[PDB]
């Protein structure tokens, strides 16, 4: 046992998509508020979400400073003022490395143009939370060659649906004259084992 009031936060989890990273935890405070601290293995601790009653804390602005670094956060529980229980109680979060763990966002097919017997499919680059002096960097700007986009396309008279892959944001596939095709794209970081693919983009078809 230790001090009177307050309980330590638990189940710290990282919610991250295209680098928009939010730390979430339990439980819903009762006569206690929280403050979050985050740091790289060798760097100083930076406080965020000061005395918040929320059970989440946006850490985006800190991690986009270097998405490849490995961050650790911890959540402190303070007794609501007077309840000074008769160092503060805290809990560490799992380590988190943005570049290797952030979820790849849902892509969007920007357009598709017919060119005789071939079809070009363009993926709109996805904006990420990483900034480059006034603008938001794209998934490709951040991952470069580590990022590829996959395309699923099918006819209607087809029986299986084919796939194509690209190192850019454009596909140039061979199609059958006449027939109308349907497409769906997916972001992928092949060098990943877990979370290596984004959710599929809305389906688009030539009508």
């Amino acid at each position: 046992s230790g001090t009177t009031n307050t309980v330590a936060a638990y189940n710290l989890t990282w919610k991250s998509t295209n680098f928009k990273t939010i730390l979430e935890w339990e439980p819903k405070p009762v006569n206690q508020v929280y403050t979050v601290q985050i740091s790289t293995k060798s760097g100083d601790w930076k406080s965020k979400c000061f005395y918040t009653t929320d059970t989440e804390c946006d850490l985006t602005d800190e991690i986009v400073k270097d998405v490849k670094q490995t961050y650790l956060a911890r959540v402190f529980s303070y007794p609501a003022g007077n309840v000074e229980s008769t160092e503060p109680l805290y809990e560490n979060s799992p380590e988190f490395t943005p570049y290797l763990e952030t979820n790849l966002g849902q892509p969007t097919i920007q357009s598709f143009e017919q060119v005789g017997t071939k079809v070009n499919v363009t993926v709109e680059d996805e904006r990420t939370l990483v900034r480059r002096n006034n603008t938001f960097l794209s998934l490709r700007d951040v991952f470069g060659k580590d990022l590829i986009y996959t395309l699923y396309y099918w006819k209607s008279s087809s029986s299986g649906k084919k796939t194509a892959k690209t190192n850019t944001n454009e596909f140039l596939i061979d199609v059958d004259k006449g027939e109308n095709y349907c497409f769906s794209v997916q972001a992928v970081i092949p060098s990943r084992t877990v979370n290596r693919k984004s959710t599929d983009s809305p389906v688009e078809c030539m009508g």
Partner: protein, 142 residues
């Protein structure tokens, strides 16, 4: 929207789904392949969470699966860009920007102070030596 006569028109994804909202079967009849229909259904039937325009203070919402992402303007942060960075000037936040000592003043702006041997500069945050050998400085490096 299926109302006798419209149904005479040939199955069109665009007309039965993008303009009239389809159900799962109507869409599958059009796609024929179940995995194809799923693929289409995951997003179509997910919902536009950005509809509640959740990103505040000029933020930009981008849809995701059962969620969304908010892109905030420089002076804001938070899942919904609700946090005003300009309202966090408190001592527990990187020492309130003070070079040495920071004193919080609820109701008003925090102030910065300095250790004996130093004095506050016009900028209200920096400290400068008032003696030849202030504490905490290494002369041979300085």
């Amino acid at each position: 929207a299926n109302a006798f006569l419209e149904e005479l028109r040939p199955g069109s994804l665009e007309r039965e789904c993008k303009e009239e909202q389809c159900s799962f079967e109507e869409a599958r009849e059009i796609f024929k392949d179940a995995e194809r229909t799923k693929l289409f259904w995951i997003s179509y039937s997910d919902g536009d969470q950005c509809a509640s325009s959740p990103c505040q203070n000029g933020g930009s919402c981008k849809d995701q699966l059962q969620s969304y992402i908010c892109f905030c303007l420089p002076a804001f942060e938070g899942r919904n860009c609700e946090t005003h960075k300009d309202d966090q000037l408190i001592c527990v936040n990187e020492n309130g920007g003070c070079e040495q000592y920071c004193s919080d003043h609820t109701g008003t702006k925090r102030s910065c102070r300095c250790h004996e041997g130093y004095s506050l500069l016009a900028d209200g945050v920096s400290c400068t030596p008032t003696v030849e050998y202030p504490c905490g400085k290494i002369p041979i490096l300085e």
